[PDB]
């Protein structure tokens, strides 16, 4: 956790039905944006930690 | 300017008409003044007093 990675993501395409048998048990309470419609939006600049 | 009154009927009709489609663009206290942006924005919770 002290030494988290920091991923850059550009020029792809994201799809978030994938993420069910890799994060079983997950939990994607989040902030700023509405989940519900997270498919249909563009997003310049994605950092994963 | 002879026929001042007729154009001062037409003016305030079209600039009435202009400053209420101007004032559709106002922010009234908002995050942002698009309805769209607000609904993919926030929860309905606060997008329902927004």
Redesign the interface.
């Known amino acids: 956790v002290y030494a988290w990675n920091r991923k850059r993501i550009s020029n792809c395409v994201a799809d978030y039905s994938v993420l069910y048998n890799l994060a079983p048990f997950f939990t994607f309470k989040c902030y700023?944006?509405?989940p519900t419609?997270l498919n249909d939006?563009c997003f310049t600049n994605v950092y994963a930690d | 300017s002879a026929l001042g009154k007729l154009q001062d009927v037409v003016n305030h009709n079209a600039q009435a008409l202009n400053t209420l489609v101007k004032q559709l663009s106002s922010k009234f206290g908002a995050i942002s003044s698009v309805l769209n942006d607000i609904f993919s924005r926030l929860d309905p919770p606060e997008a329902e007093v927004q």
């Open positions: 700023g944006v509405s419609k939006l």
